[PDB]
UniProtKB/Swiss-Prot annotation:
One of its GO terms (cellular component) is protein phosphatase inhibitor complex. The gene is PYL1. It comes from Arabidopsis thaliana (Mouse-ear cress). Upon interaction with ABA, the 'latch' and 'gate' loops change in conformation leading to a tight dimerization and the creation a surface that enables the receptor to dock into and inhibit the PP2C active site. The chain holds residues 24 to 210 of 221 of the full protein. A motif (Latch loop) lies at residues 119-121. Belongs to the PYR/PYL/RCAR abscisic acid intracellular receptor family. Changing residue 120 to A: Loss of affinity for ABI1. Its main location: cytoplasm. Abscisate binds at residues 63, 93-98, 120-126, 143. Keywords: Abscisic acid signaling pathway, Acetylation, Cell membrane, Cytoplasm, Membrane, Nucleus, Protein phosphatase inhibitor, Receptor. This is Abscisic acid receptor PYL1.
Amino acid sequence: HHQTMPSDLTQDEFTQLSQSIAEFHTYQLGNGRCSSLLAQRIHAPPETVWSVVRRFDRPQIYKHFIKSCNVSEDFEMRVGCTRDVNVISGLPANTSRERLDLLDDDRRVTGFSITGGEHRLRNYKSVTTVHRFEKRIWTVVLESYVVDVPEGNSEEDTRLFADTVIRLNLQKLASITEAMNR
Ligand SMILES: O=S(=O)(NCc1ccccn1)c1ccc(Br)c2ccccc12
């Protein structure tokens, strides 16, 4: 009977995904670090959702606020590879240099680090996992990150900021992967 946020896992989701949260979405914290975890239900099959989420060279497919994303001409999508993204004009960030940490097509886990460019999300590190759900098939996407808290900002402000980006991105991901349906 308390105030439940829409990006929080529901009880049912948590009971299905608790171990994935333990393995993939938990961070060591304390002292100028903050982290968060967001969930997005998607009425599309997990493999469709994953096929988008895994495209490290093409975040624009579903992420917002990207003027451009450039990978090298000899780009092979493997762990360690990098992308340079340019944020649309007018935001508090201009560029992000990002590195692919994780890519598991079997378990549907990917992750990246910002290493990082013109912005105030220092040492951002993020993981996204995609999961099947039944009760007739739907997907739950979990996305989390840990990131430094800028000297004169609060943890709450930092989290609100990063959460807002992730939250929109996951809405877009849901929208486009649901769009075709059948
Ligand atoms: O380059 S990004 O596409 N990184 C993906 C990303 C960045 C931050 C949080 C979640 N996900 C990006 C987009 C929009 C904003 Br506002 C950003 C602000 C700072 C750094 C990067 C930013």
